[PDB]
Design an enzyme around this catalytic site. Structure first.
Site, mmCIF file in Angstrom:
data_model
loop_
_atom_site.group_PDB
_atom_site.id
_atom_site.type_symbol
_atom_site.label_atom_id
_atom_site.label_comp_id
_atom_site.label_asym_id
_atom_site.label_seq_id
_atom_site.Cartn_x
_atom_site.Cartn_y
_atom_site.Cartn_z
ATOM 1 N N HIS A 266 10.358 23.203 18.155
ATOM 2 C CA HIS A 266 10.828 22.975 19.504
ATOM 3 C C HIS A 266 10.205 21.371 20.282
ATOM 4 O O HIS A 266 10.716 21.299 21.327
ATOM 5 C CB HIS A 266 10.805 24.013 20.412
ATOM 6 C CG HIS A 266 11.878 25.160 20.170
ATOM 7 N ND1 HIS A 266 12.034 25.791 18.932
ATOM 8 C CD2 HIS A 266 13.038 25.730 20.849
ATOM 9 C CE1 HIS A 266 12.958 26.539 18.870
ATOM 10 N NE2 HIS A 266 13.593 26.535 19.935
ATOM 11 N N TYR B 88 12.333 21.141 25.221
ATOM 12 C CA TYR B 88 13.626 20.501 25.364
ATOM 13 C C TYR B 88 13.413 19.202 26.304
ATOM 14 O O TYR B 88 14.494 18.761 26.878
ATOM 15 C CB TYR B 88 14.919 21.267 25.598
ATOM 16 C CG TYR B 88 15.095 22.371 24.722
ATOM 17 C CD1 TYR B 88 15.401 22.220 23.281
ATOM 18 C CD2 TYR B 88 15.295 23.545 25.405
ATOM 19 C CE1 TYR B 88 15.422 23.315 22.413
ATOM 20 C CE2 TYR B 88 15.469 24.644 24.271
ATOM 21 C CZ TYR B 88 15.582 24.400 23.283
ATOM 22 O OH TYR B 88 15.881 25.865 22.235
#
Ligand SMILES: [Cl-]
Ligand SMILES: [K+]
Ligand SMILES: [Zn+2]
Length: 440
Positions: free
Chosen positions: A77, A142
């Site tokens: 991530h 993100y």
């Protein structure tokens, strides 16, 4: 010596994804590229189109995600997101999967692991040497970085793990200091079911001083909740759209109606819904405006087959036709496995995806063209195809030129992954002697 199609061979896990974007940027004849390498650290390389010379890859920072005790082998991530500021410094945002307790109490969400980080090149246009700034909140996942015409920098991210607002942080000094996060999507308890409103967003440039955002909704179930105690899954549905005018600060739906921030599920369902997906489970894609200013959206969706992740999902195309949202058809007709892709649109009817899918155990990356506004696509050139593999892809490179439009990772195992820069026809090759000398 010989030319090979890949520019590096040390990717790990999923080295690229459409949500961490830009992964690469073209400027002044140089294409800069970034991906996740050993220990999930961010690596950066560049290609000079005039001289044919590659530089790098070089490690830009040190991720906590590659140095965890146990857990999932690779987290993925915190793969890198790139931005070039108005003074020519290259910024890399990386490393975060929502922070952890050691970083503080997260006031806008929950945590997981891995502090979100920010590195900058020591010199303009020089990818070989880096320094840490870590001047953004550690509670981030993100990263999506956008620079406006006036040089202002916006970093969009989820401010923690699932049960967190989505925010941006704004910098007016070339990324050296950032203002406090501004929440644009609200997490909160639902009053009708035992779940929390949660979101996934993709932010990109619009036209003028606007940023555009497409997003899907995550039903974030409490443990033991749901049907027959199914509990917490990756259940997501639907796709929504809104716009952010960076000059005025105001957000609006596709019809220009202004929205109060942070946007809640109730307001989104009333004002920003673009396409409902019924019982299909979603995985967000990206959004781009056509030449008339109208938004188009890529949304992946697939049937829930009972897995914690539902089932395989295929990219579908949605667009605003000036009066209503239309579409929802699969890009690849009758395909039932996994597909992903980013797209370019010119006239509202003319859309091209560069999409990856598998045929048997082979990985394919090919162009799919529609001339009817996304109701039907036809496959054109294949740009990369590898047996016994699957591809991870980036979003299209910022300001890409035809020879260097997308990054691709040839996943075979989860380490030693070959990285490719592809254009209209195929890969930008690299000397094997050069690559071997450079590989750290
Ligand atoms: Cl999927
Ligand atoms: K992706
Ligand atoms: Zn959740």
């Amino acid at each position: 010596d010989r030319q090979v199609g890949y520019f590096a061979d040390n990717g790990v896990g999923n080295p690229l994804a459409i949500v961490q974007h830009p992964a690469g940027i073209h400027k002044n004849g140089i294409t800069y590229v970034s991906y996740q390498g050993p220990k999930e650290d961010p690596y950066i390389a560049s290609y000079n189109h005039q001289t044919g010379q590659w530089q790098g890859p070089f490690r830009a920072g040190i991720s906590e995600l590659g140095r965890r005790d146990g857990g999932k082998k690779f987290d993925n991530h915190g793969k890198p997101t790139m931005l070039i500021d108005d003074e020519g410094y290259i910024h890399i945002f990386y490393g975060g999967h929502g922070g952890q307790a050691s970083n503080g109490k997260n006031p806008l969400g929950n945590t997981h692991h891995g502090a979100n980080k920010h590195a900058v090149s020591k010199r303009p246009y020089d990818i070989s040497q880096w320094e840490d700034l870590n001047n953004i909140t550690p509670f981030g996942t993100y990263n999506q970085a956008i620079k406006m015409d006036n040089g202002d920098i916006y970093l969009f991210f989820r401010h923690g793990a699932h049960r967190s607002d989505w925010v941006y942080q704004k910098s007016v000094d070339n990324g050296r200091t950032f203002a406090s996060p501004v929440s644009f999507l609200k997490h909160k308890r639902r009053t009708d079911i035992d779940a929390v409103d949660s979101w996934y967003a993709w932010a990109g440039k619009g036209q003028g001083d606007n940023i555009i955002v497409s997003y899907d909704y995550h039903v974030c179930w409490d443990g033991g909740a749901g049907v027959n105690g199914r509990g917490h899954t990756t259940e997501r549905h639907d796709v929504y759209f809104m716009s952010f005018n960076t000059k005025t600060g105001e957000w609006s739906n596709v019809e220009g109606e202004k929205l109060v921030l942070p946007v809640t599920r109730e307001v989104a369902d009333e004002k920003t819904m673009a396409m409902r997906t019924g019982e299909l489970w979603t995985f967000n894609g990206s959004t781009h405006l056509d030449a008339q200013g109208q938004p188009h959206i890529a949304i992946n969706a697939g049937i829930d087959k009972g897995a914690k992740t539902g089932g395989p999902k295929q990219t579908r195309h949605v667009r605003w036709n000036g009066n209503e949202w239309v579409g929802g058809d699969k890009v690849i007709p009758q395909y039932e496995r996994v597909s992903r892709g980013d797209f370019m649109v010119t006239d509202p009817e003319n859309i091209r995806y560069l999409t990856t899918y598998n045929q048997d155990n082979d990985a394919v990356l090919s162009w799919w063209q529609s001339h009817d506004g996304g109701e039907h696509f036809v496959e054109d050139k294949t740009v990369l195809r590898k047996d016994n593999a699957s591809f991870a892809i980036s979003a299209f490179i910022k300001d890409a030129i035809p020879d260097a439009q997308m990054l691709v990772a040839e996943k075979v195992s989860d380490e030693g992954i070959k990285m490719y820069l592809v254009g209209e026809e195929g890969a930008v090759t690299r000397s094997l002697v050069d690559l071997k000398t450079a590989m750290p």
